[model samples]
Target: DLADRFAELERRYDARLGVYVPATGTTAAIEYRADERFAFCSTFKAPLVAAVLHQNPLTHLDKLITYTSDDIRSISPVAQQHVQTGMTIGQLCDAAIRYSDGTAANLLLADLGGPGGGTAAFTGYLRSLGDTVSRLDAEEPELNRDPPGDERDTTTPHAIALVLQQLVLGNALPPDKRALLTDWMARNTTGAKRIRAGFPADWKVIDKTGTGDYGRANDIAVVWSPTGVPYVVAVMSDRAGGGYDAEPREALLAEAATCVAGVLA
Candidate 1:
């Protein structure tokens, strides 16, 4: 029952203070604030990908993201593959969307007409969806242009939740585009244990995870429950210190996945 699942959620989150949303806009199942902002980390690429496609529909995504930088510190895998300076805009978007490559994302950000272009695209998208509370700050030049460093980005739980809803509802991207986006999300390789944690072995759920060492943290996803109740779930946190590839973080993901899976069950 939702009541039982939510009760467990309330108890579990009381200690972590993580903000979570069940399958609704209301706070009925949980008492979390809808307006809280959390750091999105790499999850920001979702909108960036959308924006790139929106800006130029004639994009051939297959060959995108092919620039390699001599500086290994800021270079991306996609960038590493292509050494020359001139790669297609489509290729850059592919790098970020397909591989979550930072350098690829930054390169594509240039096509949005410069820095913060992705946020600009996101803002326009939100306005079209009748959403107002979501706001993404400009991309910091250091992380966007240079290597991803300490400085970070911010987003509201409400905004991210809305974005998820918009994508699933087919209000943000076209039907085909939305499906492709969701399909890519299901294939994301960044942080598996987060959104993937809450599903049965064969259950299909699409997701994206974003976290920082000590800044904005989150797990945003669209879960297609085994019983057919398709819903969106976004959990954002502000604390840190579970080592990137360590067991504690893996346990957190496993626990979170199990809990949410119980909810769907």
Candidate 2:
């Protein structure tokens, strides 16, 4: 079991692991700190993107989000490459999903609410989705300040997975919106060494990854088993609090997925 392996992970690497797999049927569900809080990191883009499509509709995505160089921020591999020209809301979604673009997220968040109010607005959207366990306190780097047990900008494994399940498989978004986000997630380039590594070659994986301090490396995904069963899994990893080592041990994340896959497969 995952619980045993997670214990081993903590002992071997000082890494704390959180995982959640919704019950697909009589098989029951699996959880390890699924209800506990962990930094959302870049993964919040998944929900932020969802909030954009959740209310604005596909037509709104055609609108432009100015790419003024001043608006750009760190860790945005996508937007930095295309600076002079403006980007559409739809393109912003790709930037967030494929490259974890921070500027793209801020722009979209601004679209959701004014620049200063976006965090609260995004949190409001979460509340609308029945999410009480997640909160977005700031934007970009500040939001990513995941100092171990700090509560700001954190989400429970179960809570994050719940929203992903809704958009990917539930009726939270229309077909066009659903398919669009799914495509974006499936094309994500950051999760190769994380959750997707644990799946069989035949199983399809669509995921979003997050990285932050305290060795935080996370992946939340919708994995379609070979039998075409869609299961949403969230894995949030971090190191112990206090004066401890903090390294983004991605291998540990992959092993977490492997543990989940053993049972799901």
lDDT of each model, Cα atoms only? Answer: 0.57, 0.86
In angstroms, how far off is 14's CA in candidate 2? 0.9
User: In model 1, which runs have C-alpha deviations exceeding 4 angstroms?
Assistant: 1-17, 22-34, 58-75, 85-87, 114-118, 140-152, 240-250
Tell me how many clashing residue pairs each candidate has: 8, 0
- What TM-score do all the candidates reach, one by one? 0.74, 0.95
Q: Which stretches of candidate 2 lie over 4 Å from their true place?
A: 241-245
Which lDDT tens digits does candidate 2 get at residues 1-265? 5688888976776778899988887557789989889999999998899889987867998997666777766688878876777888999999999999988888878888954659888998889889888999888767777567989999999999998888899988888888999999999998999999988889999999998877888999999988898899899988765233477888888888898998887
User: lDDT score of model 2?
Assistant: 0.86
Q: lDDT tens string, model 1, 1-265? A: 5445534543554323244554454223332544654556667777767766655665455444443453234425666656665567656655565566666666666566543755566556556666565555555333322112223355566667667777765567887777767777777776566667667767777777654544334677777656566666776654333333211233344465566566556
In candidate 2, the residue pairs with backbone N, CA or C atoms under 3 Å apart (3 or more residues apart, or in different chains) clash, namely none
